[PDB]
Design a protein around this ligand. Structure first.
Ligand code: CLA
Ligand code: CLA
Ligand code: CLA
Ligand code: CLA
Ligand code: CLA
Ligand code: CLA
Ligand code: CLA
Ligand code: CLA
Ligand SMILES: CC(=O)O[C@H]1CC(C)(C)C(=C=C/C(C)=C/C=C/C(C)=C/C=C/C=C(C)/C=C/C=C(C)/C=C/[C@@]23O[C@]2(C)C[C@@H](O)CC3(C)C)[C@](C)(O)C1
Ligand SMILES: CC1=C(C#C/C(C)=C/C=C/C(C)=C/C=C/C=C(C)/C=C/C=C(C)/C=C/[C@@]23O[C@]2(C)C[C@@H](O)CC3(C)C)C(C)(C)C[C@H](O)C1
Ligand code: SF4
Ligand code: SF4
Lengths: 119, 663, 86, 186, 192, 79
C-alpha cells in the first residue's frame, strides 16, 4: 500500500522532534554549568588559558603577540634611533632614547584583561 | 563572579565569529577553522540534496507525475502529525490513504529534465549524495590532520638562521593562496564542471527525452533559441551547447594566474597594482563581501531567467512553481546583496589599514575622501525617486477616486520600450534567418506600460535607499562627525550615550539593521510586481497606476481563498497556509516590541519579577539568582531579535499568500 | 568591567568627576593644562557605563572616553541589586 | 652568450657561428629556452621517425584491419582513424567497430602516457635546465666519454632533426600534391 | 645530494651538481623521490606523475596493497570459475564467469557479500585514519592478520613484503588482461 | 483530498498517488546505515572543531610531522 512508510514515521517523528530535542536541551543546560562552557567566547575560562599557553610554547608563535615583533636586529635599530636622536636632541635635553622608549612602553591600565585571574 | 542570563544571547550573537574566538591566536587557526566549517557546510548541503531526493523517492509520486506532468501535482512528503483528526479524513489525503503535501520547490521538473525516469535512479542518487557527505566530512578530518602534521613538522623545522620565523606566515599558504585558487576555481570548478554537465546532457538528458538517435553525434549541439514547443522549455541541445561554450571559455580563462609554477601566468597582486584597485586581498571579510556581491547578480538572474526562459520540462505549466521559485531566489539574492555591504563595513572596521591622513592611494582612501559627496548625492536621488513616485501615485489615486480615470499622469515607459524594441528586432532578425523558424521566447520581453514604469521607479527607489543606508554605514563605520572614534569600538555596539545630542543606532551594525528593513521592503515591492503581473497581466496593465488598485485588486481580492482555508464550514488543503499566515503575522507583530520598547523598561520589569521569585516561599530556598541572573536583553541583542522577528514575519507571510493565490 | 580612558586634551573641568554616579573618576595633578590637573579613572571596575562623564566633557571631542565591553560585564558594571555575584 | 650556450648554433664553415635567430627569440625568451630546445629535439625526433615511416610503407604494409593498412601515405591518417564521433572520442555505444571508431587511438594513448611520464614528469615534479634539455638518459651508455665527442654527437642529432623536419614537410606536401612513390614528384 | 639544492632562501639558491643528484633507478632522468625512502618498494624509486609529492605515502601504500590483494584474489576467482569450479551447493550454475555477477546479484547472494565486504571496509576506514593519525600502532595495509608467518630477520621481512607487492602488481595487470580478453573474446579461460 | 484555490478546482488539477510503496524497508535501512555513518563522522568533526588545533602536540605526540613535497613548493612559490 502507499502507506507502510508510516511505520518509520511513528518512531522517527516522535523521536527526533521530542526525545532528541528534550535530551539536547537538558544536555545544553547541563553544559552551561561546566567550567569549560562557551570557552571560546566567554572570557576567563581555563581552556582559553591553556590554549594560549600552548600556542606560546610553539617555537614559531613564541613572540607572536608582541606588536613590535619583526626587528631582525633590534640592537641595530636602537643604535640608529639613538644616533638620529642625538643630532636632533634639543639643546641640553637630558632625555635618552632608551629610557624614553622604556617609559613610552610602560602605561598604566590596571583594568585591562583583568579577567585573567579566575580560571 | 559569574555570568547572567545575557550570556546565551552574547555567545550566540558571535557563535560563528571565528575572528572573535578566544583560543584563536593566528591566521593559521582562523583559516583552518573556516576551511573545516566549509567542509561541514558542504556536507550539510549534500545531506539536504539527498533528503529531497529520498523523499521524492519514498514519500512521493515521481513515477506517476512524470507520465502526465501538466495536470498532475507532485508530492513533497507525507504528513505524520498526531494532532490531526484520528477520525474522518484530512483535506490533505484521499480518504483512507495517507496524508501528503504538494511540492512547490521545483525538483520534479529538475529531475525530469536531467533525465530521471525511475524511482530506483533517485534512490541510487540519494545513496551517492550521502556517500559524498561522508567524503566531505572525511576530507575535513584529513585537512585538519595535515595542517596539524605541518605544525608538528615544526618540531623538526629550523632555518639555522634567525629568518626561520618567516615560516609563521606560510603555514596557511594552502588556504590563503589566491592565484592557485583563482586559476583552479575558474578553470576546473566552472569550465570543466560545465563541460562535464554537457557530457551528462549528451549522454543521458537528450537520449532520455526523444526517440533513439545516433551515438550522441555533434548534431546534439544546436543553436535554435528558446521554448521548445511541446515541453515549453529550452532545447536540451541548446543547453548542452551553452554549457559547452561556457566551459571552453572558462577553461581558457583559468590559465591566467600563476598557480603551480612561477614561470607561467601573471600574479593577481601585479594585476591589481597597475589598475584602480590594489586592495588588501588578505582580508577574509573583503573576499567574502565581494563574492557575496557576486552570488547576488547570479541569484537575481537565476530568479529572472528561470521564469523568463523556463529551462525545465513543463515548468511554465505549473502556476505555483514559477512564482515560488522567482520569489525564493529574489529573497536569496537580496540577502546576499545586503550581506556584501555588511561584510564591506566589517572589512573597513576590522581588516583595513589606511594611510596617515592624506595619501590618496588606496581605493577606499579615495572613496573616503569624498564620502560626503557620495552620501549626499545618494540621498538626493533617493529623495527624488520617492517624491516623484509617491506624488504621481497619489495623483492617480486621487483622480481615480474622483471618478476621473482620464486625469491620471501616465508617463509612457518609452526607454524600456525602446530597449525592448531593439532586442525584439534583433531576435526577429535571428529568427527570420532560420529554416526552422517560428520560435518562442516566453516572457523575455513583456508588455511594458505606465504601471511598469511607476513600479520600476519604486524598485529603483528601494535599491537606492538600501544602498544609501549600507554605504553610509560602511563609509562612516570608521568614524563620522558625530562619533569620530567609531573604529576603536566593535562593529556592533549599543550607542554612545544620551549626551552629545543622543546617539541611538550609531554603530555600523545599526546601519545594517536599518538597511535590512529597506531590503525587505524593496524585495516585497519586486515580488508584488512580479506576482501581480503574473496573476492578471491585463488588469495590471490597466489598473496598476494608482496604489488603491494594488491594495484592492491584488491584496484584498487575491486573499479570498487563503482566509477561507479553515473556517466554520470545513477545511481545504490550504489550512496550513492560513494557519502559517496568521502565525507569521503574530511573529511579525511580536518583533515590534523588541524594536519599539527598549531595554530599561524591561530591565525594571525583570527586576520586579526577580523580586517576586526571591520572595516566593519555596523558590528562595532553592534559587537565589546568583548563578544565571535573569537580565533584560542588551540593546544590540534586542535590536537583532526584533529584526529577526520582523524579517521572519515579513518573509514567511508571503508564501501562504502565493500558494493561496496561484494554486 | 568597561574601559574608561582619559586623554591629554583634558583641561581639568572636574565636571566628569562630578557627573560620575559611582566614584570612578578622580582629579590628579598634572602640568599639561592651565588648570594643572587632569582626570583619572582608577576605579573603572565600578563603572556602570552611564556615560554621564562623556556628556559633561566640554572638549571638542571627549577627553574621557568610555568603551563598552558587554562580554566583560561584572556585577558592579551591571548594577545588580537583587543578585550577588560574590 | 648566444641562446644560453646551446648546441646547434655553430656554423659549419668553422671559425664562424651561424647563431641563426633572425627573429631574436633566444634573447626575447631566455626563460623558455630549455623548453624551446625540448620542443626542437622532440620535433626533430618525431620528424625523423615520420620520414622513415613515410618512405617505408611504399614497400611493406603490415597486414591488419583492412579499413586501414591500405592506400597512399596521404590517405593513411584519416583512413587509419576512421569517422570518429567528434575527435579521438571512442564510441562506447558500439565498441568493436561496426560503423565508427579509431585505429591509431592506441598510438595516441601510448604517446600520451609516454609524454606525461616523460616531458611532464621532467618539468612538473621535483627540473629541466639548459644542458639537460633533450636528455632523457636514454642510451647514454652508448654516448662516448669525451667532452667534444658528446657535443658533436648532440650537434649531429640536432641537425639531422632539423633536416628531417624540413624533409617531412616537403615530402608530405609533395605526396598530397601528386601522390606517386618515394621521389614524390609530378 | 638528496636535497633539491643548497641555500638559505629560494632566490639565491645553489642547485645541486647534476652528476651529484641521487636520481631514480627506474626513471633514470628523474631525481629520486625522497618521500618514498623507508617504504618497502623504495629501491626502484618509481614515481613519475608525482603522486607521492602530494599525497602521504601511507595512503598510496594502503591503496597499492588493497588493489594488489584484491586483484590476487580476483585473478584466482576468475581463473577457477572459468576453468569450472562452481561451489558445491546448487544455485551456483552460472555457466560463465562474465554473467556470474549479474546472475548472482539476481539470486540474492551478492547483496550478502557486499554487506560483509562493506563492514570490513568500514572497519578498514577506521584503521586507515587512526593508522595515519599516529594514534594506533599500524602500518600501511597491515590489518594485523597473519604476522606469525612473517619472517623475522629484519631483511627477510623486507623481501616478503616486497614479494607481496610484486605479486600484487602482477595480479593488477593480470586481472585487467583477464577481464578485458574475456569480453572481447567470450572464449573464457585462464589460457583464453 | 479537498482542494483549495480557484485554479485547482477550475482546471481539475489532481495529485496522483502511487498505489505501491515507493521504497522497500530494506532500501530505507540501507540509507539509514550511511546516514548513521554521516552522523558519527559529523559528531567527530564537531568535537574536533570545538576543541580546535592543539599546537602542543609536538611535545607529546609521536612522529615528527610531515609537509608534503607540493606544500613546500606552494610555500616557496609565493603567497
Ligand atoms: C503581537 C505582538 C505582541 C505580543 C504577542 C506581545 C506579548 C506581550 N507583551 Mg507586548 N508589545 C508589542 C507587541 C506584542 N507584545 C508591541 C508592538 C509593543 C509596543 C512597544 C509592546 C509593548 C509592550 C509593553 C510595554 C509591555 C508588553 C507586555 C507584554 C506581555 C504581556 C502579555 C502576556 O504575558 O501574554 C503572554 C504572551 C503571549 C504572546 C500570549 C500568547 C502566548 C502563547 C499563545 C501561548 C504559549 C505558546 C506555547 C507555549 C508554544 C510554546 C513555544 C514553542 C516553541 C513550543 C506579553 C509577553 C507587558 C509585559 O511583559 O508585562 C507582563 C508590558 O509591560 N508589551
Ligand atoms: C568531461 C566530461 C565528459 C565525459 C566524462 C564524457 C564521457 C563520455 N563521452 Mg562525451 N562529451 C562531452 C563531455 C564528456 N563526455 C562534451 C562536452 C562533448 C561535446 C563535444 C562530448 C561529446 C561526445 C561524443 C560526440 C561522444 C561522447 C562519448 C562519450 C563516452 C565515451 C567517450 C570517451 O572518451 O570514453 C572514454 C563517455 C560516456 C561517445 C559515446 O560513447 O557516445 C555515447 C561519443 O560518441 N561524448
Ligand atoms: C585580456 C587581458 C589580458 C592581458 C592584458 C594580458 C597580459 C599579459 N599576460 Mg595574460 N592571459 C589572459 C589575458 C590577458 N593577459 C588570459 C585570458 C589568459 C588565459 C589563457 C592569460 C594567460 C597568461 C599566461 C599563462 C601568461 C600571461 C602573460 C601575460 C603578460 C605577457 C604578455 C604576453 O606575452 O602575451 C602574449 C602580459 C602582462 C605571461 C606573463 O608575463 O606571466 C608572467 C604568462 O606567462 N597571460
Ligand atoms: C535655501 C534653501 C535651500 C537650498 C538652496 C538647498 C539646496 C540643496 N539641497 Mg536642501 N534643504 C533645505 C533648503 C535648501 N536646500 C531645507 C530647508 C531642508 C530641510 C527639509 C533641506 C533638506 C535637504 C536634503 C535632505 C537634501 C537636500 C539636498 C540639496 C541639494 C540638491 C538639491 C535638492 O535636493 O533640493 C531638494 C530640496 C529639498 C527636498 C528640501 C526642501 C526644499 C526647501 C523646503 C526649500 C526652502 C527654501 C527657503 C524657504 C527659501 C526662503 C527664502 C527667503 C527666506 C528669502 C542642494 C544643494 C540634497 C543633497 O545634499 O544632494 C546634493 C539632499 O539629499 N536638501
Ligand atoms: C511608509 C513608511 C515609510 C516611508 C514613507 C519612509 C520614507 C522615507 N524613508 Mg524610511 N523607513 C521606514 C518607513 C518609511 N520611510 C521604516 C519602517 C524604516 C526602518 C527603520 C525606515 C528606514 C529608513 C532609512 C534608514 C532611510 C529611510 C529613508 C527614507 C526617505 C527616502 C527618500 C524618499 O523617498 O523621500 C521621499 C519622501 C517621502 C516619500 C515622504 C512623503 C513626503 C510628502 C508626504 C510628499 C523617505 C523620507 C532614507 C533617507 O533619509 O533618504 C534621504 C534613509 O536613509 N528610511
Ligand atoms: C612518427 C612516426 C610514425 C608515425 C606517426 C606512423 C604512423 C603510421 N604508420 Mg608507420 N612507420 C614508422 C613511423 C611512423 N608511422 C617507421 C619509422 C616505420 C619503419 C619501421 C614505419 C613503418 C610502417 C609500416 C610498414 C606501416 C606503417 C603504417 C602506419 C599507419 C598505421 C599505424 C601503424 O600500425 O604503424 C605501424 C608502424 C610501425 C610498426 C613502426 C613503428 C616504429 C616507431 C615509430 C618507433 C617507436 C617509437 C618509440 C615511441 C620510441 C622508443 C623506441 C625507440 C628506441 C626506437 C600510421 C599512419 C601502416 C599503414 O597503413 O601505412 C600506410 C603500415 O603498413 N608504418
Ligand atoms: C594524450 C596525448 C598527449 C599529451 C597529453 C601530450 C603532452 C605534451 N606534448 Mg605531445 N604529442 C602527442 C600526444 C600527447 N602529448 C602525439 C600523439 C604527438 C605526435 C607524435 C605529439 C607531439 C608533440 C610535439 C611535437 C610536442 C609535444 C609537446 C607536448 C607537451 C606540451 C603540450 C602543450 O603545450 O600542448 C599545446 C597544445 C596544442 C593544441 C598544440 C597546438 C597545435 C600546434 C601549434 C600544431 C606536453 C608534455 C611539446 C613539448 O614537449 O614541448 C617541449 C612539443 O613540442 N607533443
Ligand atoms: C591502483 C594501483 C596502484 C597504487 C595505488 C600504487 C601505489 C604506489 N606504487 Mg605502484 N604499481 C602498480 C599499481 C599501483 N601502485 C602496478 C600495477 C605496478 C606495475 C607496473 C606498479 C609498480 C610500481 C613500482 C615499480 C614502484 C611503485 C611505487 C608505488 C608507490 C609510489 C608511487 C605513487 O605515488 O603512485 C601512487 C599513485 C597511483 C598509482 C595512481 C595512478 C593512477 C593513474 C592516474 C592511472 C594511470 C594508469 C592508467 C590505468 C593507464 C591508462 C590506460 C591507457 C590510457 C594507456 C605507491 C605506494 C614505488 C614504490 O615502491 O615507492 C614506495 C615504486 O618504485 N609501483
Ligand atoms: C636502450 C636504447 O634503445 O638506447 C637507444 C638510445 C637512442 C638514442 C634512442 C637510439 C637511437 C637513435 C635512433 C633511434 C636514431 C634514429 C634516427 C633516424 C631514423 C633518423 C632519420 C633521419 C632522416 C632524415 C634526416 C631524412 C632526410 C630526408 C631528406 C633530406 C629528404 C629529402 C627529399 O629530397 C628527397 C630525397 C626526395 C624529394 O622528393 C623531397 C624530399 C623528401 C625533401 C638507439 C640507437 O636506439 C639506442
Ligand atoms: C596533409 C595531411 C595531413 C597532414 C599533415 C602534415 C603533417 C603536414 C605537415 C606539413 C609540414 C610539416 C610543413 C612544413 C613546412 C616547412 C617549411 C615551409 C620550412 C621552410 C623553411 C625555410 C623556408 C628555410 C629557409 C632557410 O634555409 C634558408 C633558405 C637559408 C638558411 O640559411 C636559413 C633558413 C632556415 C631561413 C593530415 C592532417 C595529418 C591528414 C590529412 O588527411 C592529410
Ligand atoms: S570633563 Fe573632560 S575635560 Fe573636564 S576634567 Fe573631565 S575629562 Fe577633563
Ligand atoms: S560611564 Fe558613568 S560610571 Fe563610568 S566613569 Fe563615566 S560617569 Fe562614571
Amino acid at each position: 500500500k502507499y502507506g507502510d512508510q508510516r511505520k518509520f514515521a511513528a518512531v522517527l517523528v516522535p523521536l527526533t522532534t521530542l526525545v532528541f530535542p528534550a535530551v539536547a536541551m537538558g544536555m545544553f543546560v547541563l553544559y552551561s554549568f561546566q567550567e569549560d562552557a562557551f570557552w571560546r567566547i566567554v572570557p576567563g575560562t581555563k581552556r582559553a588559558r591553556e590554549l594560549d599557553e600552548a600556542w606560546r610554547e610553539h617555537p614559531l608563535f613564541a613572540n607572536s603577540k608582541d606588536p613590535l615583533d619583526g626587528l631582525i636586529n633590534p640592537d641595530d635599530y636602537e643604535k640608529g634611533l639613538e644616533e638620529a636622536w642625538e643630532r636632533a636632541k634639543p639643546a641640553g635635553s637630558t632625555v635618552t632614547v632608551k629610557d624614553k622608549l622604556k617609559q613610552l612602553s610602560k602605561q598604566n591600565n590596571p583594568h585591562w584583561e583583568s579577567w585573567r585571574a579566575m580560571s | 563572579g559569574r555570568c547572567a542570563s545575557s550570556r546565551y544571547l552574547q555567545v550566540l550573537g558571535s557563535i560563528h565569529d571565528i575572528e572573535c574566538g578566544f583560543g584563536i591566536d593566528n591566521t593559521l587557526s582562523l583559516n583552518l577553522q573556516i576551511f573545516t566549517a566549509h567542509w561541514g557546510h558542504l556536507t550539510i548541503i549534500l545531506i539536504w540534496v539527498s533528503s529531497n531526493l529520498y523523499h521524492i523517492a519514498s514519500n512521493a509520486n515521481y513515477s506517476l507525475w512524470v507520465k502526465n506532468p501538466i495536470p498532475s501535482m507532485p508530492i513533497a512528503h507525507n504528513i505524520w502529525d498526531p494532532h490531526f483528526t484520528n477520525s474522518t479524513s484530512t483535506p490533505y489525503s484521499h480518504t483512507i490513504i495517507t496524508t501528503i503535501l504538494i511540492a512547490y520547490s521545483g525538483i520534479y521538473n529538475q529531475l525530469y529534465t536531467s533525465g530521471f525516469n525511475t524511482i530506483n535512479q533517485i534512490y541510487k542518487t540519494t545513496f551517492t549524495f550521502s556517500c559524498l557527505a561522508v567524503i566531505s566530512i572525511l576530507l575535513a578530518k584529513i585537512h585538519i590532520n595535515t595542517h596539524s602534521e605541518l605544525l608538528h613538522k615544526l618540531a623538526s623545522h629550523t632555518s639555522q638562521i634567525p629568518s626561520f620565523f618567516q615560516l609563521l606566515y606560510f603555514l596557511d599558504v594552502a588556504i590563503s593562496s589566491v592565484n592557485i585558487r583563482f586559476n583552479f576555481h575558474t578553470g576546473i570548478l566552472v569550465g570543466l564542471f560545465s563541460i562535464g554537465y554537457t557530457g551528462h546532457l549528451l549522454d543521458i538528458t537528450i537520449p532520455a527525452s526523444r526517440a533513439p538517435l545516433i551515438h550522441t553525434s555533434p548534431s546534439y549541439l544546436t543553436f535554435f533559441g528558446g521554448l521548445k514547443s511541446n515541453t515549453s522549455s529550452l532545447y536540451l541541445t541548446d543547453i548542452a551547447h551553452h554549457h559547452l561554450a561556457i566551459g571552453i571559455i572558462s577553461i581558457l580563462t583559468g590559465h591566467l594566474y600563476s598557480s603551480f609554477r612561477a614561470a607561467l601566468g601573471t600574479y593577481i597582486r601585479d594585476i591589481l597594482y597597475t589598475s584602480h584597485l590594489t586592495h588588501s586581498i588578505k582580508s577574509l571579510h573583503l573576499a567574502l563581501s565581494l563574492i557575496l556581491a557576486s552570488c547576488t547578480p547570479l541569484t537575481s538572474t537565476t530568479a529572472q531567467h528561470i521564469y523568463s526562459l523556463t529551462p525545465y520540462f513543463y515548468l511554465s505549466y505549473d502556476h505555483i512553481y514559477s512564482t515560488a521559485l522567482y520569489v525564493h531566489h529574489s529573497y536569496i539574492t537580496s540577502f546576499l546583496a545586503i550581506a556584501s555591504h555588511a561584510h564591506t563595513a566589517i572589512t573597513l572596521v576590522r581588516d583595513w589599514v589606511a594611510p596617515l591622513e592624506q595619501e590618496s592611494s588606496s581605493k577606499q582612501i579615495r572613496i573616503h575622501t569624498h564620502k560626503a559627496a557620495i552620501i549626499s548625492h545618494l540621498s538626493w536621488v533617493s529623495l527624488w525617486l520617492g517624491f516623484h513616485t509617491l506624488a504621481v501615485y497619489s495623483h492617480n489615486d486621487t483622480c481615480i477616486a474622483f471618478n476621473s480615470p482620464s486625469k491620471q499622469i501616465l508617463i509612457e515607459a518609452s526607454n524600456g520600450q525602446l530597449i525592448q524594441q531593439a532586442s525584439g528586432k534583433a531576435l526577429y532578425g535571428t529568427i527570420n534567418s532560420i529554416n526552422n523558424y517560428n520560435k518562442s521566447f516566453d516572457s523575455f520581453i513583456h508588455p511594458i506600460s505606465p504601471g511598469d514604469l511607476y513600479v520600476h521607479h519604486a524598485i529603483a527607489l528601494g535599491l537606492h535607499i538600501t544602498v544609501l543606508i549600507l554605504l553610509k554605514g560602511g563609509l562612516e563605520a570608521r568614524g563620522s562627525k558625530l562619533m569620530p572614534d567609531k573604529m576603536e569600538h566593535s562593529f556592533g555596539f549599543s550607542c554612545d550615550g544620551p549626551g552629545r545630542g543622543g546617539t541611538c543606532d550609531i554603530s555600523a551594525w545599526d546601519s545594517f539593521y536599518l538597511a535590512t528593513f529597506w531590503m525587505l521592503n524593496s524585495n516585497a515591492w519586486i515580488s508584488f510586481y512580479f506576482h501581480y503581473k503574473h496573476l492578471t497581466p491585463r488588469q495590471f496593465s490597466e489598473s496598476s497606476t494608482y496604489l488603491e488598485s494594488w491594495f484592492r485588486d491584488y491584496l484584498w481580492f487575491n486573499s479570498t481563498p487563503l482566509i477561507h482555508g479553515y473556517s466554520t464550514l470545513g477545511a481545504n488543503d490550504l489550512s496550513v497556509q492560513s494557519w502559517s499566515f496568521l502565525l507569521t503575522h503574530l511573529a511579525w507583530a511580536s518583533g515590534f516590541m523588541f524594536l519599539i520598547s527598549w531595554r530599561g523598561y524591561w530591565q525594571e520589569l525583570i527586576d520586579i519579577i526577580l523580586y517576586i521569585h526571591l520572595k516566593t516561599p519555596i523558590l528562595i530556598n532553592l534559587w537565589n539568582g546568583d548563578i544565571y541572573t535573569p537580565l533584560a536583553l542588551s540593546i544590540v541583542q534586542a535590536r537583532f531579535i526584533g529584526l529577526v522577528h520582523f524579517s521572519t514575519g515579513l518573509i514567511l507571510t508571503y508564501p501562504p499568500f502565493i500558494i493561496g493565490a496561484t494554486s | 568591567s568597561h574601559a574608561v580612558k582619559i586623554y591629554d586634551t583634558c583641561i581639568g573641568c572636574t565636571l566628569c568627576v562630578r557627573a560620575c554616579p559611582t566614584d570612578v573618576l578622580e582629579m590628579v595633578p598634572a602640568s599639561i593644562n592651565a588648570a594643572k590637573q587632569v582626570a583619572s579613572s582608577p576605579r573603572v571596575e565600578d563603572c556602570v557605563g552611564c556615560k554621564r562623564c562623556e556628556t559633561a566633557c566640554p572638549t571638542d571631542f571627549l577627553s574621557i572616553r568610555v568603551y563598552l565591553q558587554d562580554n566583560e560585564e561584572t556585577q558592579y558594571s551591571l548594577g545588580l541589586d537583587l543578585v550577588d555575584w560574590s | 652568450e648566444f641562446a644560453g650556450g646551446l648546441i646547434g648554433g655553430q656554423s659549419a664553415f668553422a671559425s664562424q657561428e651561424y647563431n641563426f635567430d633572425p627573429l631574436g627569440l633566444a634573447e626575447k625568451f631566455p626563460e623558455q629556452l630549455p623548453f624551446f630546445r625540448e620542443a626542437e629535439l622532440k620535433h626533430g625526433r618525431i620528424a625523423m621517425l615520420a620520414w622513415v615511416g613515410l618512405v617505408v610503407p611504399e614497400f611493406v604494409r603490415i597486414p591488419g584491419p583492412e579499413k586501414c593498412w591500405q592506400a597512399s601515405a596521404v590517405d593513411a591518417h584519416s583512413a587509419c582513424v576512421x569517422x570518429x564521433x567528434x575527435x579521438x572520442x571512442x564510441x562506447x555505444x558500439x565498441x568493436x567497430x561496426x560503423x565508427x571508431x579509431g585505429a591509431l587511438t592506441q598510438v595516441f594513448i601510448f604517446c600520451g602516457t609516454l609524454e606525461i611520464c616523460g616531458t611532464w614528469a621532467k618539468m612538473n615534479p621535483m627540473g629541466l635546465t639548459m644542458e639537460n634539455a633533450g636528455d632523457y638518459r636514454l642510451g647514454v651508455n652508448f654516448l662516448p666519454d669525451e667532452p667534444e665527442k658528446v657535443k658533436e654527437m648532440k650537434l649531429k642529432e640536432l641537425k639531422n632533426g632539423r633536416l628531417a623536419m624540413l624533409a617531412f614537410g616537403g615530402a608530405i606536401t609533395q605526396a598530397t600534391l601528386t601522390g606517386s612513390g618515394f621521389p614524390w614528384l609530378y | 645530494x638528496x636535497x633539491x639544492x643548497x641555500x638559505x632562501x629560494x632566490x639565491x639558491x645553489x642547485x645541486x651538481x647534476x652528476x651529484x643528484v641521487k636520481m631514480s633507478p627506474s626513471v633514470p632522468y628523474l631525481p629520486y623521490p625522497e618521500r618514498l625512502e623507508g617504504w618497502v618498494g623504495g629501491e626502484k624509486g618509481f614515481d613519475p606523475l608525482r603522486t607521492s609529492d602530494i599525497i602521504d605515502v601511507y595512503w598510496l601504500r594502503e591503496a597499492e596493497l588493497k588493489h594488489g590483494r584484491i586483484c590476487m584474489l580476483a585473478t584466482l576467482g576468475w581463473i577457477s570459475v572459468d576453468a569450472g569450479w562452481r561451489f558445491e551447493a546448487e544455485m551456483f550454475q552460472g555457466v560463465s564467469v562474465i554473467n556470474a555477477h549479474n546472475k548472482m546479484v539476481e539470486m540474492g547472494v551478492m547483496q550478502q557479500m557486499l554487506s560483509i565486504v562493506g563492514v570490513c571496509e568500514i572497519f578498514s576506514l577506521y584503521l586507515i585514519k587512526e593508522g595515519l593519525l599516529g594514534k594506533i600502532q599500524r602500518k600501511a595495509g597491515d590489518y594485523f592478520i597473519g604476522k606469525n608467518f612473517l619472517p623475522k630477520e629484519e631483511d627477510k621481512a623486507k623481501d616478503m613484503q616486497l614479494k607481496e607487492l610484486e605479486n600484487g602488481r602482477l595480479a593488477m595487470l593480470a586481472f585487467s588482461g583477464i577481464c578485458t580478453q574475456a569480453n572481447l573474446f567470450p572464449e573464457s579461460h585462464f589460457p583464453y | 483530498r479537498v482542494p483549495g484555490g480557484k485554479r485547482t478546482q477550475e482546471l481539475g488539477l489532481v495529485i496522483p498517488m502511487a498505489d505501491e510503496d515507493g521504497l522497500t524497508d530494506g532500501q530505507v535501512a540501507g540509507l539509514f546505515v550511511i546516514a548513521l555513518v554521516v552522523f558519527i563522522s559529523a559528531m567527530d568533526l564537531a568535537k574536533t572543531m570545538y576543541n580546535g588545533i592543539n599546537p602542543a602536540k609536538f611535545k607529546t605526540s609521536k612522529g615528527k610531522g610531515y609537509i608534503s613535497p607540493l606544500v613546500k613548493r606552494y610555500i616557496e612559490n609565493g603567497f
